[PDB]
Amino acid sequence: HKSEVAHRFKDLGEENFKALVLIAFAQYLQQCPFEDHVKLVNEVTEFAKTCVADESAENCDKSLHTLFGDKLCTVATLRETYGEMADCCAKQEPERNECFLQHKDDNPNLPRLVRPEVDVMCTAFHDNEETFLKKYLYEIARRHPYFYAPELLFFAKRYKAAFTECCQAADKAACLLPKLDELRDEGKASSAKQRLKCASLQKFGERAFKAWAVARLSQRFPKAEFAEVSKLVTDLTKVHTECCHGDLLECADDRADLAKYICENQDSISSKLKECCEKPLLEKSHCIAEVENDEMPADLPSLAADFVESKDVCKNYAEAKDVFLGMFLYEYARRHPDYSVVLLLRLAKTYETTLEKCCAAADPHECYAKVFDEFKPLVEEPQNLIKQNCELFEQLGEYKFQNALLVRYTKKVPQVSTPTLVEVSRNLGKVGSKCCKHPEAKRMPCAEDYLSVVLNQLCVLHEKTPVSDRVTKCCTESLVNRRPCFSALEVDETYVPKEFNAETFTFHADICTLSEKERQIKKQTALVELVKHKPKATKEQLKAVMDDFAAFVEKCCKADDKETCFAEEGKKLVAASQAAL
Ligand SMILES: O=C(O)Cc1ccccc1Nc1c(Cl)cccc1Cl
Ligand SMILES: O=C(O)Cc1ccccc1Nc1c(Cl)cccc1Cl
Ligand SMILES: O=C(O)Cc1ccccc1Nc1c(Cl)cccc1Cl
Ligand SMILES: CCCCCCCCCCCCCCCC(=O)O
Numbered sequence: 001h002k003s004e005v006a007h008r009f010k011d012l013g014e015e016n017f018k019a020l021v022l023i024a025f026a027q028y029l030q031q032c033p034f035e036d037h038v039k040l041v042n043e044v045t046e047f048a049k050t051c052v053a054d055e056s057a058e059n060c061d062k063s064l065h066t067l068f069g070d071k072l073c074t075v076a077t078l079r080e081t082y083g084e085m086a087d088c089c090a091k092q093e094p095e096r097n098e099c100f101l102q103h104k105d106d107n108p109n110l111p112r113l114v115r116p117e118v119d120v121m122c123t124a125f126h127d128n129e130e131t132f133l134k135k136y137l138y139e140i141a142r143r144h145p146y147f148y149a150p151e152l153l154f155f156a157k158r159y160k161a162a163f164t165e166c167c168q169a170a171d172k173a174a175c176l177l178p179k180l181d182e183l184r185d186e187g188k189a190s191s192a193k194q195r196l197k198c199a200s201l202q203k204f205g206e207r208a209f210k211a212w213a214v215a216r217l218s219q220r221f222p223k224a225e226f227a228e229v230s231k232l233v234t235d236l237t238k239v240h241t242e243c244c245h246g247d248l249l250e251c252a253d254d255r256a257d258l259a260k261y262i263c264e265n266q267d268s269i270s271s272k273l274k275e276c277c278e279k280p281l282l283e284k285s286h287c288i289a290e291v292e293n294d295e296m297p298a299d300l301p302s303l304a305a306d307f308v309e310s311k312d313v314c315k316n317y318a319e320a321k322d323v324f325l326g327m328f329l330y331e332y333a334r335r336h337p338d339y340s341v342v343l344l345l346r347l348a349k350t351y352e353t354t355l356e357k358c359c360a361a362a363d364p365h366e367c368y369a370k371v372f373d374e375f376k377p378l379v380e381e382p383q384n385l386i387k388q389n390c391e392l393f394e395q396l397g398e399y400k401f402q403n404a405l406l407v408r409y410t411k412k413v414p415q416v417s418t419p420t421l422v423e424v425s426r427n428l429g430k431v432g433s434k435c436c437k438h439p440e441a442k443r444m445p446c447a448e449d450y451l452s453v454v455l456n457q458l459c460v461l462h463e464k465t466p467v468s469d470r471v472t473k474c475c476t477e478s479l480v481n482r483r484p485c486f487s488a489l490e491v492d493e494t495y496v497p498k499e500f501n502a503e504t505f506t507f508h509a510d511i512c513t514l515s516e517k518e519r520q521i522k523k524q525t526a527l528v529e530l531v532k533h534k535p536k537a538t539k540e541q542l543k544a545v546m547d548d549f550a551a552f553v554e555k556c557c558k559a560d561d562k563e564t565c566f567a568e569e570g571k572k573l574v575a576a577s578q579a580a581l
């Protein structure tokens with residue numbers, strides 16, 4: 001590696017190199033126009049080949065940080081556009097890159113990205129694929145300067161496959177839109193998941209993160225010896241720490257190093273890694289992260305012998321408490337691909353609590369003997385919540401399930417924005433539709449994944465405009481207790497019912513024209529409003545009004561002279577409803 005540029009160019013290949021250079025420059029000069037970036041990319045790229053051709057040619061020996069930095073400092077408009085930032089150029093290297101890093105503007109001031117109409121997209125895509133996709137890679141990149149670049153490239157290649165398949169299709173729109181919606185929802189997720197994990201590291205500390213890592217790596221690689229898992233957790237934590245700090249190159253080298261180590265040791269780690277470990281460097285660690293849980297060994301013994309009945313337990317524990325607890329977690333997790341990572345941490349928390357008590361008691365061995373009994377109810381808490389919620393989803397399909405949740409949650413915290421109540425209830429519903437289609441053994445992990453995202457966008461909102469001490473408690477307390485804290489929220493018996501407002505409950509024929517999606521939001525918004533005005537209404541009372549309203553819609557949307565029927569029938573609907581309630 002006499003020439004870092006050349007080496008990166010060789011391993012990445014021109015196309016990927018060029019796309020990653022774009023994301024990089026977009027993530028730092030977030031205010032320059034696309035066309036600007038393209039000339040930079042081409043300049044770097046053209047230089048790059050100089051080096052591939054001959055690693056000794058001038059400047060090819062410079063480090064990437066130095067070359068990147070040099071390019072930045074040749075943007076003539078740097079001081080005018082970016083201000084302080086151009087001051088970084090007066091600093092010699094290690095300081096320089098660090099300064100630039102610091103001036104990335106997370107959530108800058110850019111207009112919301114509009115999805116054009118299907119026709120427009122397919123025509124732009126068809127007319128000039130590359131600029132069409134890289135423009136939007138730029139648009140997305142510049143609006144998230146901390147989104148892991150290679151994963152942004154991974155999204156863009158998938159968009160590419162969406163437009164390829166869909167712009168040739170019969171019904172273009174019906175093919176594409178669910179795809180774009182799927183992509184958008186995922187990227188939003190990934191973005192918030194990155195920030196979440198990093199804020200968890202800072203707030204709760206390495207140790208906790210390492211615990212989380214154990215659980216996670218154990219479920220995935222059940223055949224791996226603990227020493228091996230431990231080695232991976234150690235290194236993962238270091239990766240996380242670097243990546244959370246934000247430097248693209250160092251995060252990437254770190255992730256690569258770990259992935260190559262994993263791949264050089266597949267036999268000691270997991271049988272399912274063969275295909276990922278065949279992928280080129282760009283894709284390896286990404287692939288490994290997505291890999292399926294390895295199948296777990298057959299003759300795994302109960303944890304009794306090592307963690308309950310073995311004398312020397314306290315001795316073993318006090319010797320190296322964290323390692324020992326690491327061991328309990330390890331053993332436990334790998335036997336349970338079906339538990340959420342968080343349920344497992346609750347278990348280890350618990351195991352910790354008692355060993356702490358019993359090892360200090362008159363008779364440790366007897367004291368800590370019936371301890372796996374405590375695990376019981378913690379385990380069936382998420383299980384039952386799952387069984388019963390999927391049971392309900394199956395009864396009333398997605399929409400009515402949403403409406404059920406809608407009532408439940410509006411009652412619990414009626415101080416929340418109507419539209420926010422509608423957003424989360426619907427997302428939640430969508431989590432039903434996804435996870436419940438799984439067998440039991442795969443439902444809790446699934447719910448864990450999806451709830452962490454929904455719950456989180458939910459706390460992020462609340463942090464900006466808070467409205468409930470109880471939600472603030474849940475969002476700021478333990479992330480392991482985050483979900484159970486919401487599940488513990490109760491009806492606000494304090495809430496003062498909301499003022500009746502007829503406009504809120506006035507309806508017009510335009511709803512007959514809406515799409516089932518818009519129509520539904522219309523109805524669910526009104527339902528939240530209804531529950532805020534009459535919070536003590538009964539599930540039955542509510543069902544009676546809802547049926548009453550629904551019918552009213554099917555009569556006036558199939559009525560000659562729709563609008564005089566909405567007002568007249570609506571006046572009645574409302575009076576009658578006000579009286580039932
Ligand atoms: O929804 C957004 O604002 C961003 C967006 C646009 C299109 C598709 C997905 C996403 N999510 C997303 C986000 Cl929020 C940031 C970076 C990259 C992606 Cl893919
Ligand atoms: O979920 C995590 O944060 C990481 C995770 C889970 C399961 C398996 C591997 C990994 N992490 C991981 C990653 Cl994200 C990249 C390279 C190597 C490893 Cl071990
Ligand atoms: O141990 C804790 O209380 C924090 C906690 C709660 C729920 C889920 C995970 C974590 N731990 C955690 C930590 Cl401590 C750092 C980075 C990422 C994660 Cl997931
Ligand atoms: C002189 C050019 C300046 C900046 C060049 C950008 C270099 C991009 C490097 C990103 C490599 C991504 C490899 C992924 C490896 C991994 O994540 O495991």
Ligand SMILES: CCCCCCCCCCCCCCCC(=O)O
Nearest residue numbers: 409413416420424458461462486487
């Ligand atoms: C702005 C903050 C939004 C808060 C919205 C309140 C909606 C509560 C969502 C709770 C989801 C909890 C998932 C477990 C299911 C349950 O026990 O109810």
Ligand SMILES: CCCCCCCCCCCCCCC(=O)O
Nearest residue numbers: 340343382385386389432447483
């Ligand atoms: C899955 C049904 C959609 C509605 C959401 C209700 C979820 C209730 C059960 C959540 C269990 C998630 C596991 C996280 C944990 O261990 O606490």
Ligand SMILES: CCCCCCCCCCCCCCC(=O)O
Nearest residue numbers: 505523526527546549550574577
């Ligand atoms: C205070 C009483 C005002 C009466 C107005 C009635 C509220 C109607 C909102 C109900 C929405 C339920 C939708 C059910 C469905 O989709 O069929």
